[PDB]
Design a protein around this ligand. Structure first.
Ligand SMILES: CCCCCCCC(=O)OC[C@H](COP(=O)(O)OC[C@H](N)C(=O)O)OC(=O)CCCCCCC
Length: 131
C-alpha cells in the first residue's frame, strides 16, 4: 500500500449524507470506514477491499448468508459494507437499508441466471386459478 483511498471527494460528501438506519438520527462517518476495516482484517479480509467495487461486493456475499446467524458485529458490517459498496457501483442511496434493497434487487434478477442446473433440488410450482 502506498496511497490508500476509500471514498473520494464525491463519495465522501454522499457518504456523510447516507445514514446507518432508515429510522435514526445519525449519519455515516469515517468512524464506520475505519472500524469496519479493523473487523475486516479479523475475518482474513484485507481492508483494501473496502476501496474496491469488487471487494465490497464479495464481502457482502459472505455476510449475506451469515446475517442469519450473525451478531451485532456482523450487522454493523453488512450494513456499512452495503453503503460503501453502492457508492462504488455508481449507486445513490439515503440510508443503509436503501442500499440493501438495491443490492437485493440486482441479485434477485441474477438468481435464475446463475444456476440453471442446480435449481431443481426442492419442489415448487406457480399457482393456477380460474379467471
Ligand atoms: C456449525 C456450527 C455453527 C454454530 C455457530 C458458530 C459461529 C462462530 O463460531 O462464528 C465464527 C466463524 C467461524 O470461523 P472458523 O473458520 O470456523 O474458525 C473458528 C475459530 N475459533 C475462530 O476464532 O475464527 O467465523 C466467521 O464469523 C466467518 C466470517 C465470514 C466472513 C464475513 C466477514 C466480512
Amino acid at each position: 500500500g502506498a496511497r490508500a483511498s476509500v471514498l473520494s471527494g464525491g463519495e465522501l460528501d454522499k457518504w456523510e449524507k447516507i445514514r446507518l438506519r432508515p429510522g435514526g438520527k445519525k449519519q455515516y462517518k469515517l468512524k464506520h470506514i475505519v472500524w469496519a476495516s479493523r473487523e475486516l482484517e479479523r475475518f482474513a479480509v484485507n481492508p483494501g477491499l473496502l476501496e474496491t467495487s469488487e471487494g465490497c461486493r464479495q464481502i457482502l456475499g459472505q455476510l449475506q448468508p451469515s446475517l442469519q446467524t450473525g451478531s451485532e458485529e456482523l450487522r454493523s458490517l453488512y450494513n456499512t459494507i452495503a453503503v460503501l459498496y453502492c457508492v462504488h457501483q455508481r449507486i445513490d442511496v439515503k440510508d443503509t437499508k436503501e442500499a440493501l434493497d438495491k443490492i437485493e434487487e440486482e441479485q434477485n434478477k441474477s438468481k435464475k441466471k446463475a444456476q440453471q442446473a442446480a435449481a431443481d433440488t426442492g419442489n415448487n410450482s406457480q399457482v393456477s386459478q380460474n379467471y
